[PDB]
Design an enzyme around this catalytic site. Structure first.
Site: not given
Ligand code: R8T
Length: 379
Positions: A59, A339, A358
């Protein structure tokens, strides 16, 4: 039976000058893709946004928002960058975690995409609670009115409404898709990191707008849980469907975001096990009834691998839930997995249900339209 939208270590993007973006994937490709968001237009065009995490799945890394556009039903994709990070910090500058809406904004068919933006923060966004709001943060909005071919920045009051609130360190979309209400109002589900003095660290809410330019926050908050969430419209309620470690949570507001109460047909109906995962929740008409379609991971290994990304139907009347299709019945990559985003349309007489998700650093697409009779029956 699928298509690959974005291939991990298999895409090359260019920057605003037209120079290549040398990522860390083999051959200088973008290393990893995460966090897909899909919006289908009235022309049948599919636009898929995702983080192009050029160097690593983290992230906290160097990220642009990619957009893939298909006009052939998801068989082939034209790819580009829709939103560039500010290019302050070659390690950390990022735009991330898209939420999209397709809407007719005072007649004008528009795709909106909203992403969080950071530059120098080296920690997860929930760590930054000292300011109202964090100086490193922003929340930017881009639009396309040419069927997804070009995106431009929208100048909004979103930063201003966060500052004026005074109790929010940062805000982000709920991830995946927002909605246009029956009446025309635009709604993004949101996540909020509250300032340090607020005992709730996290909350869920939404922002709303008529024109896509001037937005508003309701005065109330929903409990945060794992904060990623989507909203559906059901009668005069807005209903959210929120990530949580273990059982997903669902609340309804009957006063347009002043107060929230549990929504029994969806609350605690799907288990995502340890840590939770983002999930996509939309409605599908069945006559003058509605069914909720939902995607999230079974997570058979009870960890960050988030196996078995699955489509469920929620009966919004009886509260029954069932598994429609385990469309990604694989163990994910714990670097970042699980996701998804659903998209339903009826264009003319043709109903489509699509998903993106994903898959080991790639983003895949499936056409799940064959499941519509089963979902629509679930009322
Ligand atoms: C902004 C941010 O950190 N978002 C990340 C999410 C965030 O770190 C958490 O929701 C905590 O705020 C989680 C996450 C995941 O669980 O895979 C991926 C997502 O990009």
């Amino acid at each position: 039976e699928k298509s690959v939208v974005f291939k991990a270590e298999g895409e090359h993007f260019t920057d605003q000058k037209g120079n290549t973006i040398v990522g860390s994937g083999s051959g200088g490709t973008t290393k990893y893709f995460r966090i897909p968001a899909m919006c289908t237009t009235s022309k049948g065009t599919i636009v898929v946004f995702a983080d192009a995490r050029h160097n690593t799945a983290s992230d906290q890394s160097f990220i642009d928002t990619a957009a893939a556009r298909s006009t052939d039903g998801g068989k082939t994709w034209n790819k580009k960058i829709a939103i560039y990070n500010d290019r302050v910090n070659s390690k950390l500058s990022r735009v991330m975690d898209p939420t999209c809406i397709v809407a007719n904004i005072q007649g004008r068919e528009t795709i909106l995409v909203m992403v969080g933006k950071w530059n120098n923060n080296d920690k997860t966004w929930g760590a930054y609670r000292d300011k109202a709001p964090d100086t490193d943060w922003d929340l930017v909005l881009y639009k396309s009115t040419d069927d997804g071919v070009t995106f431009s920045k929208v100048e909004t009051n979103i930063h201003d409404i966060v500052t004026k609130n005074g109790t929010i360190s940062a805000m982000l979309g709920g991830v995946g898709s927002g909605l246009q209400l029956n009446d025309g109002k635009l709604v993004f589900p949101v996540q909020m990191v509250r300032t340090k003095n607020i005992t709730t660290v996290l909350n869920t809410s939404f922002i709303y707008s008529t024109d896509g330019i001037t937005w508003s926050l309701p005065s109330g908050y929903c409990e945060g849980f794992g904060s990623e969430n989507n909203i559906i419209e059901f009668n005069a309620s807005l209903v959210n469907n929120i990530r949580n470690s273990g059982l997903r949570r669902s609340f309804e507001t009957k006063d347009f975001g002043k107060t929230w109460t549990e929504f029994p047909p969806m609350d605690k109906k799907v288990d995502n096990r340890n840590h939770g995962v983002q999930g996509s929740t939309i409605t599908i008409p069945s006559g003058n009834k509605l069914v909720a379609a939902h995607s999230s991971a079974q997570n058979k290994n009870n960890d960050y691998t988030r196996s078995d990304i699955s489509l469920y139907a929620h009966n919004l009347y009886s509260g029954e839930v069932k598994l429609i299709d385990d469309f990604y019945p694989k163990v994910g990559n714990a670097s970042g997995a699980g996701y998804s985003c659903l998209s339903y349309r009826k264009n003319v007489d043709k109903e489509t249900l699509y998903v993106v998700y994903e898959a080991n650093g790639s983003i895949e697409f499936q056409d799940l339209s064959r499941h519509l009779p089963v979902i629509k029956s679930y009322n």
